[PDB]
Write a structure and sequence with these properties.
Four copies of one chain form a homotetramer.
Chain A lengths: L6 E2 L3
Chain lengths: 11, 306, 306, 11
């Protein structure tokens, strides 16, 4: 499992 | 004196990065002139983030949904693109703070100062070292995709890295600002891991030069060994093989400290077999390899950057 | 997901440092607002370096004798001053890039990200820890004095240090921007060996907490040790004694990782007695003691700065 | 023999 980075940002 | 992870100053790179938002997936992207570089997986949502198809995903996306934030000032998008692994969003304005830059792909072993940034703002800096398996032991958390691993030579920044992902083992991987990916990895959630790691010999030698210059001379010994014997003993000890051009690149250090390359090379090969024996070198009890000879000569002589 | 000596971004501090020149001697100087904070020994020459008379030396030097360069722009002094050991040269203009500065002192154990500058220009950054003997294991060369070791709380710069001299053992000494030395020092080239050094226990505990958080749990053990027993073990092992206040500091780390403070105090007690057993933690065979719990939380929770 | 850092700049 290769985690992939991103920001989980609302709205 | 002294010797630490002397990371490059980051003022010329802080002001040239923006946040990149599309849909609910957000990440930070580098901003140069009228172009905003961001990882291509910005478009992917967690629903379809495993084995995606970027060619049609970009087609579905438009100019309006690519919303980029230059910190507080709202930024307008007037274009889009997708080269090998990174988008190339264009913006109406041109960044005042863009420094002299050049995208440089660096061979394994070269070190650079990463500007770890979360939600489009600087968070910290430190020197990574691109291991032979094309992975950097970064310190990145969620929202870090796009933290450029810049590098400053003569006041011209040389963006040589752009973070994309981790690995199950715990290391990170990313593309150069050109877009061509670093190593064999792919940008999908597929089970994906790096090969065996190899300690970089030239960086160890540069670190030992720093040790000798900083008054640490206990590991030096009269013994001297030839290049090929050292290569084999390092091979049985998982070190990257030493070639003559490396001895060439250590030349300035050898001249400065007065110690021949092969002398400390035999010292190192004896150190590996005998072990560290307990007493430390510059506060490290392990053969630390993240200093290139350029970094050592930079830190032990003093180089201007302005 | 990794953990390295991650130092604060420096763009807010790079543009606030200038050259200060008094005759032959030139060195770094912080340029907050219209004041240029430079160390006392700018006036002092090599001839009168040992046991100087700063009170008379400053009187002997006039305003025009103080040559201050902001990179290429020439600065004109409109007056000077003298706090405890730092000068307060004023300039005609006011730095546009001055951030929200806040002069503070730091108790031994607090860490800050220095901005080692040579010839009035930023050169690099790293995290130093104010050791209990009031010295920092810096990486400074000749001409680096006045290179402030700053700190960023949330959005404001919080200058904590200002490099002045070097010690024969290799460590360095400096002042707050107020001017008072850290510990028992004098500003003269006289025998000034610092006292014995003690490993900072709370920082070691924070480092171990970071190690637990980043997937390393091998050193954790069932056995639990009370605080007083831990202190009586640690004093013979040179570690600084642990107090209830420190345990209160580690509260967020204990809550986040779920591990009780005393359990990992016992783990550190066992680790420190038998030894590292020859397998590293976070790529270190010796216990790191330069990570504050605030820094660990900052690096493992994505704190924002802008 | 405490060293005291400063720059050796001519003119």
């Amino acid at each position: 499992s290769a985690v992939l980075q991103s920001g989980f940002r609302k709205m």
